[PDB]
Write a protein that binds this ligand. Structure first.
Ligand code: HEM
Ligand SMILES: CCCCCCCN1CCC[C@H]1C(=O)N[C@@H](Cc1ccccc1)C(=O)O
Ligand SMILES: C=Cc1ccccc1
Length: 455
């Protein structure tokens, strides 16, 4: 039953590339999926991939015996500053499994318990900032969520204070990062990146890369000379030994891991929190239910690790926000061997796939007719959800290593926001999703009304 797969409109020798000439390429690709269905071919000069949108096909793509992680063009461009750190290495590169073995214990339960106090440090700064707003001032949500998540990975992971809440403008790092990511997303559609029209982009790309590397130097300098005894992510990077190869990470790879974790360790969690608050103010009944949980569980001025673990409904709220708007919206795979997808689409060894996660999460055959509704109760029973229906953290051994960190931070912070404030969508905000490879609301503002509960 070999089928012929659809393909969106082409532009001569540029093939489908100009379809990416937009500030919202993932959303453009979702619209193409709406029109073409669960699978479509997408070509650019010298490259073919296939976008998958249905759980029917993606459950086969998640078979690690048949498919391995591929570096998308986006990840290849990010590799220009993230090197062979965990997220931009091939599975078969020595440094992938070696760093994985070394850094996995930094996300154990016992590690999470160790990060918790510093997580609270930053969360309290967020709550205090909002308690200190004047009447009828408002909250810039993604901006403040990015302050929080950047500061949290800096402090918990590296004992470094970005002090983002002492800045009215984004930290230098954030500004460069967003620009490197902008450049990487915009470079996706460039048919001739060597055209001298892009010489300034190339120069600016290097400038932003040094800014990001300078902080990495300072983070490493401060730890090596410190007199304090740390046990955090940096500690493991500098001292951990891989059981398999027996070797620690070398200095060049450590630097790549720091860049990787500073970016991956915050940018998507700030998007998650922004989307979760958006859906909560648009769904007051859900907000109330999660606020009731927050009030019942967070009975102390400072949340404890054990209490965050009991914010189970807040946890479902976050999962449902990742369902509708997974903030890292795609991942890529290649066929390890010739194989047939869905009994219908033969693939040759090396053939590539793109998993379009926001579209997967809208598969009506899985979620039902109410698929656009925000119903955290969808997640009450993981056993009732078919395999590989829900993939906001990627797949298999290349799934997100930071998943527990992200969800613990987001549950703590959202729990505290719902404990301490009522929220008002005072502008009737119209969701507008900015793309920097990752996804985040833009211009989302709310007003908080303090419940006047002491910290
Ligand atoms: C809600 C927040 C987050 C989301 C949605 C998310 C999502 C993802 C996804 C989809 C991947 C797979 C990428 C691929 O297959 O190409 C991934 C990989 C990764 N994530 Fe996350 N992530 C989040 C938070 C974090 C945090 C906080 C950290 C660091 C503490 C982190 C570190 C990583 C790393 C290192 C990888 C590469 C893993 C490997 O291949 O060994 N992520 N993440
Ligand atoms: C933090 C998450 C980063 C990974 C998500 C990247 C997700 N892309 C970000 C923009 C759109 C989306 C994507 O579909 N990209 C493809 C684009 C592409 C396909 C075929 C030929 C050329 C280029 C790619 O990069 O290969
Ligand atoms: C570079 C960071 C990153 C984080 C999540 C998915 C892919 C890449």
């Amino acid at each position: 039953t070999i089928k012929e797969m659809p393909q969106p409109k082409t532009f001569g020798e540029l093939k489908n590339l100009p379809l990416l000439n937009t500030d919202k390429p993932v959303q453009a690709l979702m619209k193409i999926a709406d029109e073409l269905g669960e699978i479509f071919k997408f070509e650019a000069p010298g490259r073919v991939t296939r976008y998958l949108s249905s759980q029917r096909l993606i459950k086969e793509a998640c078979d690690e015996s048949r498919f391995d992680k591929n570096l998308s063009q986006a990840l290849k461009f990010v590799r220009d500053f993230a090197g062979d750190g965990l997220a931009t290495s091939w599975t078969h590169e020595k440094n992938w499994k070696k760093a994985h073995n070394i850094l996995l214990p930094s996300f154990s339960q016992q590690a999470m318990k160790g990060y918790h106090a510093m997580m609270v440090d930053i969360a309290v700064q967020l709550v205090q900032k909002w308690e200190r707003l004047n009447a009828d001032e408002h909250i810039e949500v993604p901006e403040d969520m990015t302050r929080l998540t950047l500061d949290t990975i800096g402090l918990c992971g590296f004992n470094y204070r970005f002090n983002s809440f002492y800045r009215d403008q984004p930290h230098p790092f954030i500004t460069s990062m967003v620009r490197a990511l902008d450049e990487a997303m915009n470079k996706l559609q460039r048919a001739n990146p060597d055209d001298p029209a892009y010489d300034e982009n190339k120069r600016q790309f290097q400038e932003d890369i040094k800014v990001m590397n300078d902080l990495v130097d300072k983070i490493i300098a401060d730890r090596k000379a410190s007199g304090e005894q740390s046990d955090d992510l940096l500690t493991h990077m500098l001292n951990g030994k891989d059981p398999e190869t027996g070797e620690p990470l070398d200095d060049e790879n450590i630097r790549y891991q720091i860049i990787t974790f500073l970016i991956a360790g915050h940018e998507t969690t700030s998007g998650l929190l922004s989307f979760a608050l958006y859906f909560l103010v648009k769904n007051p009944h859900v907000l109330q239910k999660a606020a009731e949980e927050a009030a019942r569980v967070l009975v102390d001025p400072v949340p404890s690790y054990k209490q965050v673990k009991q914010l189970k409904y807040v946890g479902m709220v976050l999962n449902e926000a990742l369902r509708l708007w997974p903030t890292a919206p795609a991942f890529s795979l290649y066929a390890k061997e010739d194989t047939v997808l869905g009994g219908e689409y033969p693939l040759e060894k090396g053939d590539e796939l793109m998993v379009l996660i926001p579209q997967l999460h809208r598969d009506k055959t899985i979620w039902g007719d109410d698929v656009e509704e925000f119903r955290p109760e969808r997640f009450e029973n993981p056993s009732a959800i078919p395999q590989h229906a829900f993939k906001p953290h990627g797949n298999g051994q290349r799934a997100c290593i930071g998943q527990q960190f992200a969800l613990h931070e987001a549950t703590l912070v959202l729990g505290m926001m719902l404990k301490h404030f009522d929220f008002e969508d005072h502008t009737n905000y119209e969701l507008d999703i900015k793309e920097t490879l990752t996804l985040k609301p833009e211009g989302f503002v709310v007003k908080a009304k303090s419940k006047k509960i002491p910290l």
